[PDB]
């Protein structure tokens, strides 16, 4: 299976007084492993997964240096973009950045990402070849030219194909008990009468990891989308995920309906036949 390492950065200007609120989180796949918050007392990158605590003092010293430098970059950027978009010094604005790398099932570099947004909208992104940029508007063309002149892409590509991958591999090995474990969904169905003549069938998928899953209802062996509700996949809080899908059916007819569950943790899709 492929694995990813991603870092997500959000900076929010507070023109009233002081520097931007800055929050950085790091993930391996769907597991957070580090965080920095400018408002926290430590002013350090902090662990958020047991397996990253294996890393000694020098790891933390290094990531703190870099994450603080990142915060200054996004502060400057908030100033610059305000200028490009001719905005008031009064209002709060946001810059978001996400970057990282995937390895394939062969544990080799697969893909690299670097995307940047201002005020919740695409601004600039590195293309898949890791050699050029996509600018969303004319302001972004300024940044594109500057980064092209300064060979940012080359620097990023070296990181993504190298350093990024190497550490991802290290993390996967150190945190193998959890990072490389697939938790298949624990499934069940509930039944709720909504009248004398109709009932709700709810098919639940619980405690699964990673978050990717497909839940669907079939009626007599054909997918059924009418009269169904599907909630978005949601975190349980213990590192796993939950989802459910529900259908309303005539009472007595529950047997026609089947819930189908697909997940990387299941060799074969599950078919629930009941209620």
């Amino acid at each position: 299976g492929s694995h990813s390492m991603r870092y997500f950065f959000t900076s929010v200007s507070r023109p009233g007084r002081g520097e931007p609120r800055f929050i950085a989180v790091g993930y391996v796949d769907d597991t957070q492993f580090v965080r920095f918050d400018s408002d926290a007392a430590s002013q350090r990158m902090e662990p958020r997964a047991p397996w990253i605590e294996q890393e000694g003092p020098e790891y933390w010293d290094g990531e703190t240096r870099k994450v603080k430098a990142h915060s200054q970059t996004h502060r400057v950027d908030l100033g610059t973009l305000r200028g490009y978009y001719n905005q008031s010094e009064a209002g709060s604005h946001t810059v978001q950045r996400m970057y990282g790398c995937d390895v394939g099932s062969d544990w080799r570099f697969l893909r690299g990402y670097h995307q940047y947004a201002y005020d919740g909208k695409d601004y600039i992104a590195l293309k898949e070849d890791l050699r050029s940029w996509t600018a969303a508007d004319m302001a972004a063309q300024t940044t594109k030219h500057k980064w092209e002149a300064a060979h940012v892409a080359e620097q990023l590509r070296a990181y993504l194909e190298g350093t990024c991958v190497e550490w991802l591999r290290r993390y996967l090995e150190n945190g193998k008990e959890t990072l490389q474990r697939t938790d298949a969904p624990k499934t069940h169905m509930t039944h709720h009468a909504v009248s004398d003549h109709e009932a709700t069938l709810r098919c639940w998928a619980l405690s699964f990891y990673p978050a990717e899953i497909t839940l669907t209802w079939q009626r007599d062996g054909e997918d059924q989308t009418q009269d169904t509700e599907l909630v978005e996949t949601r975190p349980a809080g213990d590192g796993t995920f939950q989802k459910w899908v529900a259908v309303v059916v005539p009472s007595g007819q529950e047997q026609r309906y089947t819930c189908h569950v697909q997940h990387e943790g299941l060799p074969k899709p599950l078919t629930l036949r009941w209620e």
Partner: peptide, 9 residues
């Protein structure tokens, strides 16, 4: 691990 040095926009 984080990238070492980001350029300003």
């Amino acid at each position: 691990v984080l990238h070492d040095d980001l350029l300003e926009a």
